[PDB]
């Protein structure tokens, strides 16, 4: 149904602005809010239908100590949204405490938007893990949202902070945030900073301006993830029906994404399926094996070729995953959007549950434990101090993420009747 | 509904009973013990019966005509009668 | 246009129609529509297409 | 037909001034009395047609010991009305006794105005319950008006004094006034002070200057209640035809009002019907159930949509009332006024008979009985003493309001063939 977006963190507000700009360009919308002259397709999930058919984006921007919001302010696209949903230290506990005291008015804004919406389906989160101000306050808001609304869905888009080092206290912050994400979120879309950075340095020749490109990448991914809802077909035109297949168990809810063209500015679907199963098209980094794989195709498709392609790729066994049970690949189809020039119009997406990200989490589990053992890297922050004088919440999150890694490695085994 | 004879031929009584009521009730400002109540009871039963009958005959094919039934049908009063 | 629309009015939109029936009154469903075994179905056929579209086609 | 207005009490004279100012602004009238340059619509009920087409307001201001009348005097709108209709303790019995001795000349003024009018329909009362000087004298005048004119209508606009406390003797005064209002008035429009105060603190951020805003609120409500008469349509262009539907029985004649925009400075009628049935748009505070509901719409309406809206809202069952009989909602339509800028031009009003106000009356019945039982709160006022040495009129009003609450609760039951 109707989904409200929340955006917080500097990179999160960047990709939210880019996402809304991308959808305004994608649909028949002017940057004033007015419907375009040449506008069939649904805008009834993320866009409020206002008085002059003004598709006002259903978005709530949360920030504290604004810097980039001023750059949002002086824009022609500052008249598309902001019906006054904008509300004005780099520690987790700092942002937690600051969000604690102003929980009421921002929750009042959320309830205001819930009253403004006729229906409700979910709150999708734009998040940056260990982004400083975004950390802690984002976990706090996630806990509040799970508390107040036990009937709605929570989706999280976030990047995982790895740049091969910087901040000595960020693994603690990301560990607490991951503990909150495991318990207080329903489904998590995971992203890696170094992987997207490497792809940006790969297909292009940039080294510094990675933000401006990665915004485009995440915007394309997120819009692709929502296209079958935005452009109505009839397979999984609800969020919940899509998410139900992707989550095999409530302990594994992290989703790996790709994108079939690394650059799209006339191959068949058979080729790009083979491309997508190659890991260079995969944008998120014993044997690691998928549990369940889904793919979504949008382009110029012949309907017989997808069947024979599934036959041939099935027989070729390019799906290097061994499950513990009956779970298999799932196909889906979406519409190519108008008004956008696309060479090689076939474009696909993948949503798969893969165990390999456990190793990435294990990297942080190694790092944090190392800095815990030497104990010269907690640095004695005061917000961390009165929030927890004994710092046993870090031990609690360490317990949870250990259980999580064990659940991962039990899922790697060909039986999940045994647990980890 | 003038072209349809039964519904016409009961709405006539629906008007006539209100005329008899309005004439009768204005007569005495004290209570009717002079058999005004005797006719009034007859009028009450016949009014309920006639209204239910015409409503059942009526239930033309226009949106507003379908609309005006349902306000009386809020509690199915003439339909539980 | 009628032919394409007919199989769009049964066989998206009808998913919302069935989720209401998931949780009686046949006129209730029409109002819910307009903005497991058994069921009744109905839709009017206009005459200039009724000379090609059959009544028994609706059954199949 | 032709309606004369009477205004008494400080807040009553405030809202009368605001009401006349609002109608002078609303119609093509200058504040000198002259017709505007750009003036179709009827002003032949509340405005005498004078010599230079001077729409002189048909109003009689009654006051004693004037304070705010001096502020009325020095105004540009002191030349619109006052063709000399102005005539110069906070106890009920004090105002009763003072109105007793000067009943003759004010009745002579009333007869003078009745002779000045060609036709007559009603005396609409601007009243403040337990306003001090307004109390008692207003009841006295109400009794006199019912006595002298048994062929005319009496409408009462009044606020009910509740501010969550103040005056220990005001429940006695309001109880006597309510006894008079039940017997000597034909239809009563009830208002609550704390409810309007809460709405004023809600939509705005004021705490003290509530009077200046509440004047606007009551003026808008009263003008909306008269718009179909002031702007001629053809449904219920008489007072009596409108009042006949609203009163289901002569014992229940109190009317609940709303206003669809809490602030109006392009939604459809379907939305604002759903809004109006939400109690936050309702401005007056087992199950409490409406007996009969009416609504009046003024705006940019499509005539097919109101039918289908009535269908859908009927099927949704957002009308949480259970009657004892056949009574249902009634729709009405009015014209949007010119010369006034209105964003979201659709504006509605509701007139409904609801039992919940009994509880409010019960609150006063509890309070007065409590102060009667301890007997330290009558305070021995002398006007109360020689008016009634035994104070059995308070017992008489207590008897009447008990009968009234019992009539209320018998009406709550699914049969009214039994009484209470």
Planar angle of CA D131, D136, D140, nearest 5 degrees: 135
Rounded distance between C-alpha atoms, residue D333 and residue D308, angstroms: 16
- Helix boundaries (H) for D74-209: 92-101, 103-116, 134-148, 170-184, 193-203
3-state secondary structure of D351: strand
> Positive or negative, the Cα torsion across A280, A282, A283, A289?
negative
Nearest to B77 among D311, D314, D326 (CB): D326
Region for D30 from its dihedrals, namely left if φ exceeds 0, alpha if ψ lies in -120 to 50, beta otherwise: beta
Helix (H), strand (E) at residue D61: strand D59-62
Structure-token pair, residue D139: 């009841």
> Positive or negative, the Cα torsion across B36, B38, B44, B49?
negative
3-state secondary structure of B25: helix
What DSSP designation does D122 have?
E
Helix (H), strand (E) at residue D3: strand D3-7
Q: Which residues of A299-317 are buried (b: 16+ CB within 10 A; e: fewer)?
A: bebeeeebeebeeebeeee
CB A2 within 8 A of CB A57: no
CB A349 within 8 A of CB A259: yes
Rounded distance between C-alpha atoms, residue A263 and residue A392, angstroms: 47
3-state secondary structure of D56: strand
List the one residue out of D184, D191, D92, D166 whose CA is nearest residue D135. D92
List the one residue out of D242, D278, D241, D276 whose CA is nearest residue D347. D276
Q: Is D266 on the interface with A (CB under 8 A)?
A: yes
CB A197 within 8 A of CB A231: no
Calculated CA dihedral for residues C29, C35, C36, C37, nearest 10 degrees:
50
Helix (H), strand (E) at residue A348: strand A347-354
Rounded distance between C-alpha atoms, residue D212 and residue A108, angstroms: 28
Rounded distance between C-alpha atoms, residue A182 and residue D351, angstroms: 53
Contact between chains at A52 and D267 (C-beta distance less than 8 A)? no
List the one residue out of D147, D148, D155 whose CA is nearest residue D122. D155
What residues of A are in contact with residue C15 (Cβ under 8 Å)? 234, 237-238
Contact between chains at B67 and D329 (C-beta distance less than 8 A)? no
List the one residue out of A330, A335, A185 whose CA is nearest residue A252. A185
Structure-token pair, residue D217: 């609120």
Helix, strand, coil abundance in chain D, percent, nearest 5: 45, 15, 40
Structure-token pair, residue D62: 């009654």
Angstrom resolution of this structure: 5.3
Rounded distance between C-alpha atoms, residue D288 and residue D320, angstroms: 9
Chains D and A touch (3+ CB pairs under 8 A): yes
Calculated CA dihedral for residues D274, D280, D285, D286, nearest 10 degrees:
60
* Strand-pair partners of A266: none
Q: In what order do the strands lie in the sheet with D329-334?
A: D86-87, D59-62, D3-7, D122-128, D153-160, D187-192, D254-257, D347-354, D290-298, D329-334
**What is the Cα D335 distance to its own chain's centre?**
22
List the one residue out of D248, D326, D245, D319 whose CA is nearest residue D289. D319
- The residues, ordered by sequence, that sit 6+ positions from D161 with a Cβ below 8 Å of its Cβ are D128, D129, D130, D131, D170, D174, D193
Rounded distance between C-alpha atoms, residue D83 and residue A386, angstroms: 75
List the one residue out of C19, D62, D159 whose CA is nearest residue A238. C19
CB D28 within 8 A of CB D38: yes
CB D257 within 8 A of CB D351: yes
**Total number of residues shown for chain D:** 420
Rounded distance between C-alpha atoms, residue D394 and residue D179, angstroms: 9
Mutate which of B67, B73, B76, B81 to test chain D, going by most D C-beta atoms within 10 A?
B67
CB A161 within 8 A of CB A170: yes
Helix (H), strand (E) at residue B3: none
CB A295 within 8 A of CB A256: no
Helix, strand, coil abundance in chain B, percent, nearest 5: 65, 0, 35
Contact between chains at C12 and A238 (C-beta distance less than 8 A)? no
Q: What are phi and psi of A5, to 5 degrees?
A: -105, 140
Structure-token pair, residue A292: 């369940």
What residues of D are in contact with residue A112 (Cβ under 8 Å)? none
Rounded distance between C-alpha atoms, residue A222 and residue D231, angstroms: 54
List the one residue out of A264, A229, A232 whose CA is nearest residue A46. A229
Residue of chain C with shortest Cα separation from D315:
C28
**What is the Cα D66 distance to its own chain's centre?**
23
**Gaps (C–N > 2.5 Å) in chain B: which residues precede them?**
59
Helix D392-412 vs helix D170-184: crossing angle, to nearest 10: 60
Report the helix count and the strand count for chain C, using DSSP H and E.
Answer: 5, 0
Q: What are phi and psi of D197, to 5 degrees?
A: -65, -40
Rounded distance between C-alpha atoms, residue B51 and residue B48, angstroms: 5
**What is the Cα D4 distance to its own chain's centre?**
14
- Count of CB atoms situated within 10 Å of the CB of A209: 10
Place of tokens 């009395």: D33
Place of tokens 């769009």: C8
Helix (H), strand (E) at residue D87: strand D86-87
Structure-token pair, residue B20: 């008899």
Q: What residues 1-60 of chain C have any CB closer than 8 A to a CB of chain D?
A: 28, 31, 35
Place of tokens 């497991």: C36
Rounded distance between C-alpha atoms, residue A391 and residue C23, angstroms: 48
Structure-token pair, residue D272: 């604002």
Give CA separation, A171 vs A9, A277, A394, in Å: 17, 32, 10
HSE on the CB side for D121, CA within 13 Å?
18
CB D118 within 8 A of CB D101: no
Place of tokens 């839709």: C43
Helix (H), strand (E) at residue D6: strand D3-7
- The residues, ordered by sequence, that sit 6+ positions from B43 with a Cβ below 8 Å of its Cβ are B17, B20, B21
**What is the Cα D235 distance to its own chain's centre?**
21
Give CA separation, A160 vs A202, A282, D39, in Å: 20, 16, 70
Place of tokens 């998928």: A290
What residues of D are in contact with residue B75 (Cβ under 8 Å)? 323, 326
Rounded distance between C-alpha atoms, residue A271 and residue A251, angstroms: 34
Give CA separation, D324 vs D61, D137, D175, D248, D295, in Å: 42, 38, 29, 12, 21
- Helix boundaries (H) for D204-343: 210-230, 239-246, 269-276, 303-316
Calculated CA dihedral for residues D63, D67, D69, D72, nearest 10 degrees:
-160
Rounded distance between C-alpha atoms, residue D154 and residue D328, angstroms: 25
Rounded distance between C-alpha atoms, residue A321 and residue A315, angstroms: 14
Q: Which residues of D65-96 are buried (b: 16+ CB within 10 A; e: fewer)?
A: ebeebeebeeeebeebbbeebbeeebbbbbbb
CB A224 within 8 A of CB A342: no
> Positive or negative, the Cα torsion across D206, D210, D212, D215?
positive
- Helix boundaries (H) for D38-129: 68-73, 92-101, 103-116
Place of tokens 């004298």: D137
Rounded distance between C-alpha atoms, residue D182 and residue A388, angstroms: 65
Rounded distance between C-alpha atoms, residue D321 and residue D354, angstroms: 9
**What is the Cα D121 distance to its own chain's centre?**
17
3-state secondary structure of A323: coil
**What is the Cα C29 distance to its own chain's centre?**
11
Rounded distance between C-alpha atoms, residue D240 and residue D169, angstroms: 36
Mutate which of A236, A237, A333 to test chain C, going by most C C-beta atoms within 10 A?
A237
CB A86 within 8 A of CB A69: yes
């Amino acid at each position: 149904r109707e989904i409200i977006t929340l955006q917080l963190g500097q990179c999160g507000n960047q990709i939210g602005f880019e996402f809304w700009k991308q959808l305004c360009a994608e649909h028949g919308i002017s940057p004033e809010g007015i419907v375009e002259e040449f506008a069939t397709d649904r805008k009834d999930v993320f866009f409020y239908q206002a008085d002059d058919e003004h598709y006002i984006p259903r978005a709530v921007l949360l920030d504290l100590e604004p810097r980039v919001i001023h750059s949002i302010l002086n824009s022609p696209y500052a008249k598309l949204y902001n019906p006054e949903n904008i509300y004005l230290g780099n520690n987790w506990a700092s942002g937690f405490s600051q969000g604690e005291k102003i929980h009421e008015d921002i929750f009042d804004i959320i309830d205001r938007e819930a009253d403004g919406s006729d229906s409700l389906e979910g709150f999708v989160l734009c998040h940056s893990i260990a982004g400083g101000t975004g950390s802690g306050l984002g976990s706090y808001l996630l806990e509040r949202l799970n508390d107040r609304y036990p009937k709605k869905l929570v989706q999280t888009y976030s990047v995982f902070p790895n740049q091969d080092e910087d901040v000595v206290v960020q693994p603690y912050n990301s560990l607490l945030t991951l503990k909150r994400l495991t318990q207080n979120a329903d489904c998590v879309v995971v992203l890696d900073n170094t992987a997207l950075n490497r792809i940006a340095t790969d297909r292009l020749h940039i080294q510094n301006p990675s933000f401006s490109q990665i915004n485009q990448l995440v915007s394309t991914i997120m819009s692709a993830s929502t296209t079958t809802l935005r452009y109505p077909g009839y397979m999984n035109n609800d969020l919940i029906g899509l998410i139900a297949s992707l989550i095999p168990t409530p302990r594994l809810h992290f989703l790996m994404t790709g994108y079939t063209p690394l650059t799209t500015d006339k191959t068949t679907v058979l080729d790009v399926m083979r491309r997508l199963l190659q890991p260079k098209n995969v944008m998120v980094s014993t044997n690691h094996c998928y549990i369940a794989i889904l793919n979504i195709i949008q382009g110029e498709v012949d309907p017989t070729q997808v069947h024979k392609s599934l036959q041939r790729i099935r027989e070729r066994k390019l799906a290097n995953f061994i499950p513990w049970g009956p779970a298999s690949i799932q196909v889906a189809l979406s519409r190519k959007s108008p008004y956008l020039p696309s060479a090689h119009r076939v474009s696909g997406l993948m949503m798969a549950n893969h165990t390999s990200i456990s190793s990435l989490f294990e990297r942080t589990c190694r790092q944090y434990d190392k800095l815990r053992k030497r104990e010269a890297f907690l640095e004695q922050f005061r917000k961390e101090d009165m929030f927890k004088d004994n710092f046993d919440e870090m031990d609690t999150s360490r317990e949870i993420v250990q259980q999580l890694i064990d659940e991962y490695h039990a899922a790697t085994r060909p039986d999940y009747i045994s647990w980890g | 509904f003038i072209l349809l004879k039964p519904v016409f031929h009961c709405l006539n009584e629906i008007l006539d009973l209100c005329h008899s009521f309005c004439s009768l009730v204005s007569q005495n400002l004290g209570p009717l013990d002079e058999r005004g109540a005797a006719q009034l009871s007859i009028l009450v039963k016949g009014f309920s019966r006639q209204s239910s009958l015409l409503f059942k005959i009526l239930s033309h094919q226009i949106n507003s005509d379908l609309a005006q039934l349902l306000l009386r049908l809020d509690y199915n009063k003439y339909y539980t009668q | 246009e009628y032919l394409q629309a007919m199989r769009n009015f049964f066989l998206d939109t009808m998913y919302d129609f069935y989720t209401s029936i998931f949780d009686q009154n046949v006129s209730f469903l029409n109002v819910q529509l307009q903005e497991l075994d058994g069921l009744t179905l109905s839709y009017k056929v206009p005459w200039p297409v009724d000379i090609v579209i059959s009544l028994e086609c609706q059954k199949i």
